[PDB]
């Protein structure tokens, strides 16, 4: 078909309101198969407190807009004259993403979904992508979206100097836009590719979404149906199973590893903190705590400087100049009212300024030994993607500027601007 976010109708998506112990099941097409919800429920709410189900949005009472889906119901609200409703705002994203619970009134349940399905150009869409997250019994989110590559793949660790095993997470490997002459040899649509020198073989494609087996173990399975197999396996249909493991203790990142290769039925283990609860990895402020993240970080001191130099940071590039105002700091004059944490100014014409990240939209993340600060919600690019900036922090106890260091623009990839920043404040 292709009507109203097609690639999303293939699955039933969950979302949660942790403050109220509510687990939501979302099926934009209205067919999650939950007897307690009703056959046409589009948004079903599982009240875990009373263990009961209530549809809060019906697929047959849908109103669609460019980036908005509203589902009404015939259920009267606690507030007289109002019916229960559910509303999902869509924004362009680079991965399939997840429907994030935003808030709920007594009558309306609001969600926000940043997904490749809501972009203006099918350009960001993967050939095939599946849900890449799962909630545990405590309603904590285990999200692998950050590991999904929109270009290239991951070289898996094994012991075959004739085989090079490449995989992507929750989707096919983009072989067209690949810089590796090796990956550029893989078949399109493949999520797992075996390169036996001057030859590549699709040994797995995405089908089902990520699954949680234990509070610290996530499993993803790629398969292949029908004949036409490589046959080096002797009639065995290729299959790949990846087990993502959340380490009990923080540690440096490790590469996924091949633990089995029983003839076209590869098994990989990947120990990564991305498999842990998301709230253990992220903060919506410039600090991480030992209590919540097992790491103590505070970037607030980077927004302050001696009464001698600029109140903001300047990161020059070939055709643009970037001004960064971090952790509530002050912005450069040129980026006046704009309210941007990161602002891009065209060198050739300084009247062209684009917000590349807003202060109210920040995520400080620490996972697998890397500290990242992300500012999002910037002005939309032609693709519909709101500009965003990612600052890859690096520990350096003797970093210049008395430890504060300074941001260095390292490049742009489709409206996501990257910077590297060595600072003593990134030392864990
Ligand atoms: C889910 O439950 C809700 C809550 O009751 C219902 O929501 C109402 O839905 C109607 C549409 O059926 C809404 O009315 C429509 O609003 C559109 C937007 O209005 C704003 O923006 C325009 C910009 O052009 C302004 O002109 C306008 O003043 C507002 O600022 C309008 O564009 C629509 O206009 C079209 O229809 C009307 C007649 O309905 C024509 O006169 C016009 O020429 C034009 O063709 C329309 O007015 C209404 O606002 C919603 N109420 C809310 C949100 O509280 C849903 O209908 C229900 N779902 C289902 C399936 O029934
Ligand atoms: C992105 O930042 C904006 C503000 O900079 C947040 O959006 C605001 O949300 C409130 C309600 O919470 C609205 O009243 C405002 O109108 C919104 N601002 C505008 C003009 O868009 C948004 O919530 C931030 N994203 C997240 C998830 O933190």
Curated annotation (Swiss-Prot):
Coiled coil: none annotated. Disulfide bonds join 9-29, 37-44, 77-107, 92-119, 132-170, 186-193, 233-264, 246-276, 286-327, 335-343, 381-415, 395-427. Glycans are attached at residues 72, 361, 396. Palmitoylated. Undergoes cysteine S-palmitoylation which promotes interaction with the retromer cargo-selective complex which mediates its retrograde trafficking to the Golgi apparatus. It is found in: Golgi apparatus membrane; Endosome membrane. Residues 7-121, 130-278, 284-428 form the MRH domain. Binds HA-I and HA-II plasma membrane adapters. Interacts with DPP4; the interaction is direct. Binds GGA1, GGA2 and GGA3. Interacts with the heterotrimeric retromer cargo-selective complex (CSC), formed by VPS26 (VPS26A or VPS26B), VPS29 and VPS35; which is involved in retrograde trafficking of the receptor from endosomes to the Golgi apparatus. Belongs to the MRL1/IGF2R family. Mediates the transport of phosphorylated lysosomal enzymes from the Golgi complex and the cell surface to lysosomes. Lysosomal enzymes bearing phosphomannosyl residues bind specifically to mannose-6-phosphate receptors in the Golgi apparatus and the resulting receptor-ligand complex is transported to an acidic prelysosomal compartment where the low pH mediates the dissociation of the complex. The receptor is then recycled back to the Golgi for another round of trafficking through its binding to the retromer. This receptor also binds IGF2. Contains 15 repeating units of approximately 147 AA harboring four disulfide bonds each. The most highly conserved region within the repeat consists of a stretch of 13 AA that contains cysteines at both ends. This is Cation-independent mannose-6-phosphate receptor. It comes from Bos taurus. The chain holds residues 49 to 476 of 2499 of the full protein.
